[PDB]
Design a protein around this ligand. Structure first.
Ligand SMILES: Cn1cc(-c2oc3ncnc(Oc4ccc(NC(=O)c5cccn(-c6ccc(F)cc6)c5=O)cc4)c3c2-c2cccc(N)c2)cn1
Ligand SMILES: Cn1cc(-c2oc3ncnc(Oc4ccc(NC(=O)c5cccn(-c6ccc(F)cc6)c5=O)cc4)c3c2-c2cccc(N)c2)cn1
Lengths: 262, 259
């Protein structure tokens, strides 16, 4: 259940805040490894059922191994002074942070260097490689977005999960979720990357989203987005879920597109 | 006061264009018999009603005249909710226009020379307003409006990242605080609609400024253009330029560029 994923609270040292809000709090931390060495980590803390659902999320994350899906380093159990459990999820710390902030930063002079096309396409390939993995596992992500993608120390992206505009039209009206709903969100993520941090659908408010989409309107081709990267991303927004490509078809579409450019 | 009000008969309300906690399209019948497309913003607190002091705003502003300041065609009184009548502008607000420029099926890619014109435009309007000793107190690319001829005029639909550091700690507003909002708006334009201070939340903003940190130079911003907007963010208000000085620096920079 939680055996081999639980870490004794003694082995964790919490530091400053990385980000706060209404998905808990994520902070830097030191994790004492059975190696005897210490490791830099991100510890996301946060209610009766929200506790067990929190531990339920580490369930069907405990055993996920792919270079493009975020690793779990463990779960912790902190006892309140009142004795209530306070669950904590432990992740490897990533100095480069989430992809959304990194895309915006690239447009500033003192942030990361200007990201070329080949690198933006590798960003999507990484997400495609990982979501393809998670699709084979028959795991529904349901929150795919640039803000949820983390950058590894080797500048490879990995999928994670800390929002109407990333939700497929079929899931908006009827509260359902298929693998194809995930694929719709992937199309929006490639839009964020190709726009380098733009909020989806400029000009349209959240409450109009279902109707905007019900009238056949889709995200606009980003300026300087090449005319075949847009088809791959537009293919994720077909109205029938069954008519959308699979994560494995998309990945190849991006891989062979990447190695056509110099 | 009166003599700036218009009869509700000569106004016809249409669909909503935006809403807070509202702007509607409409038609206005004018003295010359013609009908003009207008925006109608419908505002207040009535337990006690400083509309007496708001008609002042509508009065003091409806007799200003400058190409880079929005025209106010008058006020309409309905019994009671006041409504403000502005000319309709198909190109809409500048913020939404900048983002559109980065997408095909939208206004074409704005070159830097045109982007400087948007800046010159705004500085001109604020030079006019500050010479009349008028305090905007909310200047941003969202509050700017694009005329039928491509031209920006200052308005206020009626914002921590745009507020100056002196106005955060204390609550003082001066023409120097508006100059701070100008440099942020300049940064908005150079980034074609980026939210200020990526990576910083709103609660950190005051602490972020008190440590000497400012907005970062855009990916392609000329050094001279970053120097002008950086002047707007000096920690001492008395060391920031005035809108008249600012106007001439942007006009000289813009004319130094190729056509
Ligand atoms: C400079 N800087 C750096 C950083 C920073 O570094 C980091 N390193 C690591 N994690 C970081 O946050 C996190 C924290 C938790 C997660 N996830 C889960 O907990 C999780 C749980 C249960 C299940 N799943 C899951 C679901 C579906 C899947 F398919 C796979 C997994 C999950 O993912 C992902 C990221 C950061 C950050 C940070 C912190 C706060 C805000 C921001 N914006 C960045 C900050 N500033
Ligand atoms: C495609 N599209 C286009 C449009 C659209 O067209 C338009 N035409 C005209 N007004 C438009 O809204 C307005 C409405 C009111 C104002 N202001 C005042 O009322 C005002 C009052 C009292 C005082 N002051 C003032 C203060 C300081 C000054 F220095 C000067 C004046 C003022 O300003 C400015 C804009 C639009 C829009 C619209 C509508 C909704 C949302 C968005 N985002 C755009 C929509 N969609």
């Amino acid at each position: 259940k939680l055996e081999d994923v639980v870490i004794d609270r003694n082995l964790l040292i919490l530091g400053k805040i990385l980000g706060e809000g209404e998905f808990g709090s994520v902070m830097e931390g030191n994790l004492k490894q059975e190696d005897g060495t210490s490791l830099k980590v991100a510890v996301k803390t946060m209610s009766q059922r929200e506790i067990e659902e929190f531990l339920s999320e580490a369930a069907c994350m405990k055993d996920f191994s792919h270079p493009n899906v975020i690793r779990l380093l463990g779960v912790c159990i902190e006892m309140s002074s009142q004795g209530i459990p306070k669950p904590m999820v432990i992740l490897p710390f990533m100095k480069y942070g989430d992809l959304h902030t990194y895309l915006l930063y690239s447009r500033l002079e003192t942030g990361p260097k200007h990201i070329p096309l080949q690198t933006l396409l590798k960003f999507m390939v990484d997400i495609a490689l990982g979501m393809e993995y998670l699709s084979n596992r028959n795991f529904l992500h349901r929150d795919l977005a640039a803000r949820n993608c983390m950058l590894r120390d080797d500048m490879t992206v990995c999928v994670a999960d800390f929002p109407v505009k990333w939700i497929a039209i079929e899931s908006l009206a009827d509260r359902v979720y298929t693998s194809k709903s995930d694929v719709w969100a992937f199309g929006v993520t490639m839009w964020e990357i190709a726009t380098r941090g733009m909020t989806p659908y400029p000009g349209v408010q959240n409450h109009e989203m279902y109707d905007y989409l019900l009238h056949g309107h889709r995200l606009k081709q980003p300026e300087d987005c090449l005319d075949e990267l847009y088809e791959i991303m537009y293919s994720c927004w077909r109205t029938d879920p069954l008519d959308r490509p699979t994560f494995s078809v998309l990945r190849l579409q991006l891989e062979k597109l990447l190695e056509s450019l110099p």
